[PDB]
Amino acid sequence: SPILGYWKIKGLVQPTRLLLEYLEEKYEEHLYERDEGDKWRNKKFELGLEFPNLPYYIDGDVKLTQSMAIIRYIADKHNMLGGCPKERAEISMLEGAVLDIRYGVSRIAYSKDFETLKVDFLSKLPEMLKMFEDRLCHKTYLNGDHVTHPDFMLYDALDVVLYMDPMCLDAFPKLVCFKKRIEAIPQIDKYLKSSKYIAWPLQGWQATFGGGDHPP
């Protein structure tokens, strides 16, 4: 069965875990704890990876790194990437727009001067969320009636910005409805209640925002 290797955090891989649980696919996790940086560095160059990094995904057919290449491969193997160039570009554009939010947090989350950079991010965040509000005006999910990988990426981004500002969705009822819809998927519900779910941290443990061993 496939092996998914990452830090014991949400970070870059949480959307991939959510997709694997939505598809109900068997996989093994190799999790690196806060004190297992040495364990990772001594294995890193001996797994056959062409671009050694975390996370990594190893099945029969593939040895992958790059979080976007991994989530796209799992989608692609399930016929979820889109049927024609236009639909595939729509899905890649949604991907990018979600990363503008999720990388927007990560960019500033490890900085000494985080409190200053937060003011600016929370000023631009409304506009980014409005575009998703409009996309989800009459669509159950970002691509219509059927779930795609950017749904889990957006879920993860909403999870993270709600910690930084618990009122950030008060203006965005369609995003609140979308978020509850994801959570009501029976196999997502079971995952979120399971011993396998990693609630914290959001970033690397060293992060000034969404770090430490426990929520603040």
Next chain:
Amino acid sequence: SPILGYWKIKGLVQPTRLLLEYLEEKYEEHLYERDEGDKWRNKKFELGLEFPNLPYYIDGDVKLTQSMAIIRYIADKHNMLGGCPKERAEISMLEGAVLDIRYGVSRIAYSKDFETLKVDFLSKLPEMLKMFEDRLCHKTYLNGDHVTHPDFMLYDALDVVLYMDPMCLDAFPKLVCFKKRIEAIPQIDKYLKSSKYIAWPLQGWQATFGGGDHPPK
């Protein structure tokens, strides 16, 4: 014809430009100059873009933003993304590894403490480049005998890191050769010599690094 809208810099879109020139595909550029922030603010919500942003690519019915969605769409229309899930994953992985170098530069280039952040980046860069040197063992391009979009992304990343550290490819002669090989593609050489080529800046004009109006002579 397709419209490619961006700032008059290299930045996010330069690999897209190179790919269009490789394909010899006709396109028009809407180029926003340093003084045209107002021009853009005014047109931004008027173009029919679902996720308004720079760069944008407008192809009659197809209206796209996100640089990676744009370069992938152009590749996809020419059947260049990969024939099966495994080949499509190899191209996606190459794409991500190039972006770790290119975004690695962009994420510190707008910082006040660039000189401090540069030391940390240049202690990691030799190993990141080594992974590309190793991939080019017995290969003309990153995916073998045929050009793919990550080749133009790597070419762009190599141009940018050579400005930050002129010696960073001294240990990597297969990367020096790769960069010369791209520049010997005849439709690339023609573009690089033309009046359409934007040599500078690398980042937004306001950047601590790769910014301003001319390179250092």
